[PDB]
Amino acid sequence: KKEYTGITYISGPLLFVENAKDLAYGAIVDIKDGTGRVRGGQVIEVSEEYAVIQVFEETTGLDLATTSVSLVEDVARLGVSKEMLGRRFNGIGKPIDGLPPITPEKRLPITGLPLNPVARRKPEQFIQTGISTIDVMNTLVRGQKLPIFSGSGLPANEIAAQIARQATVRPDLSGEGEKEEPFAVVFAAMGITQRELSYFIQEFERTGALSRSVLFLNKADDPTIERILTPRMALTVAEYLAFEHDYHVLVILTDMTNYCEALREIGAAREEIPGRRGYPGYMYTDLATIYERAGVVEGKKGSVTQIPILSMPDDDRTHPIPDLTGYITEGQIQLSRELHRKGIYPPIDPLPSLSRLMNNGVGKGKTREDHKQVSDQLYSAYANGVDIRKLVAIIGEDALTENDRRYLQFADAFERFFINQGQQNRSIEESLQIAWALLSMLPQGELKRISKDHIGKYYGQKLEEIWGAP
Amino acid sequence: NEIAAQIARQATVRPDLSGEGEKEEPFAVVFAAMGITQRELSYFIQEFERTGALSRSVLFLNKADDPTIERILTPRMALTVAEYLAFEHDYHVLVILTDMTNYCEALREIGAAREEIPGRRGYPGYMYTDLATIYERAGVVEGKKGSVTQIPILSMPDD
Amino acid sequence: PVQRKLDPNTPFLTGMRILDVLFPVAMGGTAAIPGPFGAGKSVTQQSLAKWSNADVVVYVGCGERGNEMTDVLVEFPELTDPKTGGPLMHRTVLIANTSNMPVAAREASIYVGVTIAEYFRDQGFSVALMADSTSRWAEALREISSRLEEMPAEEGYPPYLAARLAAFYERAGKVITLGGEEGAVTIVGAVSPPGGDMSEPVTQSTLRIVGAFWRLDASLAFRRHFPAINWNGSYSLFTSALDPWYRENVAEDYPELRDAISELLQREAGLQEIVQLVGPDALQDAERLVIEVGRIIREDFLQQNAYHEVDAYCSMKKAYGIMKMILAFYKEAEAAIKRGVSIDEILQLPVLERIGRARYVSEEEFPAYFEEAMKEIQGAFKALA
Amino acid sequence: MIQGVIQKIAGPAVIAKGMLGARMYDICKVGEGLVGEIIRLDGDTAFVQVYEDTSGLKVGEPVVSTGLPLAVELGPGMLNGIYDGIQRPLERIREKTGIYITRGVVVHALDREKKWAWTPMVKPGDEVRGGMVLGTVPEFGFTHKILVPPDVRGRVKEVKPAGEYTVEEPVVVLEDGTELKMYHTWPVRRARPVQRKLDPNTPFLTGMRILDVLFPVAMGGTAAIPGPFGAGKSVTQQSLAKWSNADVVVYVGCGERGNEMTDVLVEFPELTDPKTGGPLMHRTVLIANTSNMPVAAREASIYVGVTIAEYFRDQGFSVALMADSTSRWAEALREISSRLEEMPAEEGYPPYLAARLAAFYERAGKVITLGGEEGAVTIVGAVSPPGGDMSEPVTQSTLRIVGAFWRLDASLAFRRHFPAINWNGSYSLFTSALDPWYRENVAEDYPELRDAISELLQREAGLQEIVQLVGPDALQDAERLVIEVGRIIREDFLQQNAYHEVDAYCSMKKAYGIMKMILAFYKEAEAAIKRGVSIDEILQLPVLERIGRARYVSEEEFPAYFEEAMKEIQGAFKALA
Amino acid sequence: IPGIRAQIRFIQQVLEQREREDTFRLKRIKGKIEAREAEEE
Amino acid sequence: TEALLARYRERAEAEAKAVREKAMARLDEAVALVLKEVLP
Amino acid sequence: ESAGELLVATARTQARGEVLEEVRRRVREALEALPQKPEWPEVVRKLALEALEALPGAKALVANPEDLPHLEALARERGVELQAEPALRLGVRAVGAEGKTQVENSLLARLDRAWDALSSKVAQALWG
């Protein structure tokens, strides 16, 4: 137990210690004060003269005469185990569920290593989230990074919880017919409040989804360094499970805006010159190191999928955070305040949403052979209906043709039945059924983007779907 | 300037409506000018002469060719005189501060010489407190008949 | 310390129609009121202190005018506490640190106020805490850091401002006290962004923590339309959890009426884009009716007079009755429109004046007035048809 | 060999003491040893920027200076290989450490175990200069020439006979003791010397009719393309690589996202070289970087690729170099500049961004190599501004130095028009200099036909308001003829199918023939319109079908089909009268 | 539309200028604190 | 079928007691094994 | 369905945690009985030697007054000052030259540091 007491400076979150050249850079330390309370810290800089430690909590009660500094670990590491499933952690790996600590199978550095580009393979298979707007029009493929763009007052937490407790894989659609690979969800929440914490605990406990999930929860009043460390620990657990036990892992990061703010605060505390808009100049690299840890690997059956969630600061898509997130990931799902105020949940706007890997995750060997054509037909028809709804305001309905009235009614019904699915869990077949029922409102020859065989096979169904699932 | 002079000339209470007694107390005017040009000063002097108000007016004049750092002290001296008169001799004082923009300019110069952390557009971060220590000196005090009324004048840059 | 943190179930009734209906806040929640100078934050906070249903109100004047404190001190003893009927000042604790008081004491005043609120919560009461401005606290921190020769983060603020704000705001909530009782602390904080810019770091940091957000609008204040709350930029995250209480204590279909009102406002906001493009007369009859109903909602329900002897306070049932009347009139008007009745005829119907004046009816006369107005509304179209 | 110890560690910045004599921009080993770079000297102190993560280092650990700046190994063994930004073979890294790239790993760019068939071409006592040829090595059907380093002179004392040797073998030893191996090292930031730089008077044939005709690029020129999603940029790049004049293709990733780089890495090994049956990778060099790789590698990838291309053209070949997204490289440069606390110029970028872009783009050109032979490098760099704005500084800086601009559009791709280059926004600056070659090698009136086609397209585009407002049937006969001729052009000349067996490649002769057929039909139709014939009758003529099928005719069979169609064109009008 | 575009670019340039000035001030104060802690010996 | 938790409760109690009795067998051996490493 | 599986899993985890805590408590109590064994002076001398060797240039050594006589001979050969400390039980602490650095070598601290690593070994020994 090496101990240091040569503290010569305390101010803000920083304290200096002398004759501490034995501390490795980036090490984790614990500071003991005069009363015996122990609080943690991290080495920010080490030199011959003195070392600089950033304190996790506030520096109340410290003094230069009694406090001492001890080493905990040279490199920040997390002890992972296959029995972490069903447990809750506080962002530094400490259980907060009231159960004894896990026995570590091994200890891994949370700053993982980059994947070899020649070791990756093409993402090929999809994930069923149970939300018809995502499954049909913005399909999520295993190994993809598909963020969700949210607003200030929009209900992103509800959507995150619903996706977490509804997502699953569909092997029988690919011809396998076997549920050989298990499915796990890693949920990381950064800078949440007590209300959100209680809501997430209740949601994961009431439906039994906790039995296949790992939760890293970091509250708003916790140290910001814990907020920095949380996604790295979550991704370390996800990678360990996926590439050492052949799991299919879905990772959800609840608020990347809080992470960016914490990163900016940490960078400012270390006296670094900011970049564009006052954010750190290395923010793109940090976001890339977080996001690029997902994927699929040649010779491995596991997979890692990420669904980052972030609130756009001023509903501005040119803000640095959404700009870089979209510049790294493969698309986005856009929430709409108009739909939310009109009473539609989940308020997902299909027109600005985009999935850049959807074409790989649909076809004849997976989902259904008419998936892509139905999706793009729905897109075009909804865009036309929305355009017509604006003109009918001024020129009146009776001045419109019959086809324009059909498009108007189709847009209204699409919003009322497709997007507004409530708390229901729709399979891909149910979503395609509802889509075909909606498309049948248009004339026989109006479905210009769909081949004749699929039209002859599926056209003509009536609307008897949402009424069967109250 | 014309509006301030007209207000100073025409201001009067209406005890007949309020039923407070026909005391009919004339206003005493404390006039502080910071970085004022000769034209504005001449206009104000001639107006006060014409209305016969210089017999009950205290003037603190800091012209535009005067040193710029003196503006830190002028409003404080003017308000000290106003407070003394109001709360020690029951006068009803009306204070007119000609231009707070020049005061803010002098404050910014001093702050930049000391390399204070600036607020917006380079003004020192303590400018809110600095202005509040000047404006908050007006009002009425329980148990006393005096009063201080402030009419600062400031020009918005580029409106 | 406390035993446990509970979920929000009961609403914090501020006595204002727009806040208590469109953007409710639950007992134990947090809210923020940003806005430029002259928008009316101080009057709103004073109205909350006067009319809210908290047992104890703690008011913290962190860096604001002393005339506000003198107004409270003079006026409150003459008013009556709605709960117990005693003087209003007998339930109020006032912490004052005015603009020209020492700058370093603003943070101390904030902490003293929140600690006193926590103590009164520990005694088992329902406490409301109101900070007059946290921007002054941020400015004090910036001044101290400038003296310390630190490295500022953004616009001169110290790096730990967000952490301090989060720590302050996270003490609110409904808890089980260490003695086994139940109490709560509700925090309503005001923000004063420089130049009215909502991109300022203090407002952005507050936006990520609070559960309600009541943005004030300068254009509405210029028109003298009060409380002058921007409906487009405001929200509330407690709406869903308070539905059972509303159904039990207000009316069975109250959430449906609230949703209908919000949808009408959304449709009017959507139509305003076309209105400002081609003028209000280019629209059809249905769109014109929607615009007129939105105007009626704005000028007869959301609007409220803080100085009126009756309009100052409004119970939940009164708001429910008013919105029920408005919705019934809208339904009858659209039915009449479908039958070819001109829009200008509808606007001249005499029941509109009754609906507009309904806000000034006292709490005792209102139950009969609502029935009379509903019968008049039914007759004005159904009997006229 | 300068050795020192660590004095201070602060993030990626390391301060080393006892380093007097270390040069300014040398590569250093930090720690036990992570690769770094010196960026500052002060007394006995040197500032080192470490490429990788420094967590876990301690004060006092050794620091060693290799004494040389960033460089690449040029020699046999680079073809059919995949490298990172600083020429680290990813295949052998995977064979060593598995799916992750562990820090501190060391591998050589050129394999030290393989044996090559040496064939000397020099004799003892012969004087040699930089750039001369010493021998010959076969490589996947190529004739790799062993070249003297540019700054080496002397005369031969001994040469090894033909046989098997490794790249480490000193094949030729000069009289002053200098030993020449099969490879040498060159700094990535210094342009390789040439005898002379030639004028751009020969074309770089792409194989695509629109790029080859309307917006040509000279051999050794530069071009830029956007990167909008859904516009089929990748297939266009693959077709360009397959059907170009270039003997060797160099591809640079420079910080693309993971899945796109995965697609690129798994698609080229499937491509087939049209000039043979083997895979296309046998004459291709890949440089791949993901966004989570070290920033220094992402910054140096462009220079590494262009230096490799320069070496390959120094051997006497023609090389096509493609940069996948220069925007990501500019982003890495901006981050590096921010690390040095430099003053931003405009929108966060350093003031020297344009200088770096010019220093990269100006290495391209057709030259006379030091060996007296001729070679060229052609650069086609993609720029993908976030949001699709062309006012972004990188795009403005790029467009002021490139010779051509091929504006890919997603609107054309939405209506199944491929290769989807928008002819309205695109342009080229090489036509005037390339006209004499077109006259001498294709046809005397080729520029006139090209100008006529361009004018027809411009006139057809100028009528888009009227046709959108009132409809096509409401136009006159002349306007309707213009619209239909524009449609014929769009559907028969500009449009091209990359997956077709015969349509994938089109020489200049076939394009000239198609243009002449279209113009002849246009003139005949105009004359018939003047003679009172209806446009609806003209659109029903059978020769239009013959014109439409022209682009699916084999190259050797084309002239007879062209003659028959040219006869039918005049037959369909004059004979009916 | 072009007028709104001109207004947008004008405001953008103003904001960028202010950000550049703030960065200059930050560099100044960082240099001063380093100089103080160095020359204080 | 609303009283189906009794089976799971009995199963959980049985497995917990089985785990405890399985672990109690080598308690002293585990103590010795860890104390061997704890001592210098 | 999932509720029963979660309940049985958490019951198993609770049982494992309880038996591991029992092992930890047994070892903690066992280490308290060490000083009465005849080898206590030998092991405390070895611990002091290790602590001193780990801290070059140590100027002083502190220990329990009861353990003070055993290390008196070792103090002479190492040439360092010794002093008494009632609080320092089951361990010995070496003070650096300037007094800013301290090295504490006590059985409880060693157990706390090594239990994290040895938990897996204990589990695999208990459950095979």
Ligand SMILES: Nc1ncnc2c1ncn2[C@@H]1O[C@H](COP(=O)(O)OP(=O)(O)O)[C@@H](O)[C@H]1O
């Ligand atoms: N709800 C209201 N009802 C009536 N008048 C109001 C109301 N809110 C604000 N006002 C008027 O607008 C003024 C706004 O002043 P104040 O509330 O102090 O603003 P702020 O808090 O932004 O400084 C009040 O003095 C009052 O005259």
Ligand SMILES: [Mg+2]
């Ligand atoms: Mg106020």
